[PDB]
Design a protein around this ligand. Sequence first.
Ligand SMILES: COc1cc(N2C(=O)N(Cc3c(F)cc(F)cc3F)c3ncccc3S2(=O)=O)cnc1OC
Ligand SMILES: CCCCCCCC/C=C\CCCCCCCC(=O)O
Length: 510
Amino acid sequence: TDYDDEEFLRYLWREYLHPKEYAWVLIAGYIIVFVVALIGNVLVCVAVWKNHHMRTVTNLFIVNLSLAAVLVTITCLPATLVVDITETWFFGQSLCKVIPYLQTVSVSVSALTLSCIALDRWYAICHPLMFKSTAKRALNSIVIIWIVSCIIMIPQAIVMECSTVFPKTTAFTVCDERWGGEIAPKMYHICFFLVTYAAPLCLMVLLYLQIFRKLWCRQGIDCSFWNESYLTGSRDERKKSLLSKFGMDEGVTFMFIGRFDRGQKGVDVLLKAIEILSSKKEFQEMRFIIIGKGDPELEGWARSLEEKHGNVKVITEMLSREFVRELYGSVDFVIIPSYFEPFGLVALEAMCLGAIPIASAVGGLRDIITNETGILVKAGDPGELANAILKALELSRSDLSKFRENCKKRAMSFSKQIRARRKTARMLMVVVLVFAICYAPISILNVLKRVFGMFAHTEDRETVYAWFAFSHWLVYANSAANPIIYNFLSGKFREEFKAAFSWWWLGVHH
Ligand SMILES: COc1cc(N2C(=O)N(Cc3c(F)cc(F)cc3F)c3ncccc3S2(=O)=O)cnc1OC
Ligand SMILES: CCCCCCCC/C=C\CCCCCCCC(=O)O
């Protein structure tokens, strides 16, 4: 008649010493999370492996984010519910090593996968080469993440130990970390806080802040304002009216709008090109509007060409938003001879209103301007810009209306891409924020406990064990939350969630 088999009876003989009866609010909260995390995360894998349009690098990682969340929801979640209520280990020495090893590996996989998503997004949106990763490269990085996590969390499995604690007189079994010397655990739990929480979050905040700044602000094209409908009449009716205001008659109009910079916007390239062209009879067919302020030398050069030629006009005063809109929907060509332009907001603004851009083949403008929607040249070459202004005149003897419609369709198509990339970043950023808030209490509490040595001398252990149990539930709640973020913030996931639910209950879609 051996009593080694029964640990639950020994817990009943001690149950009176530490009652809680907030156990029902924790059991209810653990069941709710268990169902939502298991249903939601499996739907994530299914929705990606069903639809081949969904197999993007961002989503393949998101599946590897749900694979680790299903692993803990099954193996680690029920064991945490029992321990945080009974304060006893009922699962034996072998599972005292495996279960905590499975949740440290899962926390490492989750931090490194979220960092690779930010990394992949930054190399695709911010890096000047605009890298386009493949599904093969995303799966090999996924394999490596699991290999790395399984190695770096091996010391945790060695350290866990299941021991019977004798001090009323009825002993009970517990599973905890057991280190030799109080010097190694403080070193390790610093390295755990860094690799799993601190270092990834600082990396992702720095990568997503550059992604937010580019997509929201630097590429923030307001299509509600830069629109064709705000104009009146036909384009040649607006052009000749505009020229007559500056004392010019009809002619192919060229427009520059930008600061007079020494190295950047490139008005010095345009000023050099006008002097090249000024020696030709084709010059008197052209009209130039140079709008800008800045370097005093280039100003004097622009006012010197303005005095000499009657088809050059320089505007140095501050222009209203609607005024630049009137120019874009009037002039024939807009010249952007930039040395450095990583966003090309001027091109999107001008093409949306019909202007045909003659721009440098630099990153922001090279992406937007194609072979059928404008003319590209070398950034620092005034002679190649002079040739392009001659080609724009030759083309302007025919009807340019076909090119204007291509420009409007290309700038709108490019704004759709920005708006699509924006929604994906906003969704990923919420996931990160929710990851930060969910792991914040348990990461801080384990640093204060294991490194700083807090909670050792207790004033009241109820509040400390309550905060510990609450923070532990929040970690599994993060696995419940992410599929809800995908449903609220991604239309591709939302419809695929509805199609998998309709098949599962009704069989109505498939
Ligand atoms: C599920 O069951 C058990 C879990 C644990 N552990 C644990 O509570 N945490 C808390 C924790 C964090 F601090 C940070 C974080 F990002 C995620 C976490 F979950 C650990 N904290 C530091 C190192 C290793 C672990 S841990 O081994 O995962 C211990 N004993 C168990 O059962 C006997
Ligand atoms: C105490 C130090 C422990 C070191 C843990 C740091 C783990 C980082 C190592 C590998 C992370 C895997 C990144 C895979 C590269 C893929 C790049 C990509 O395409 O995003």
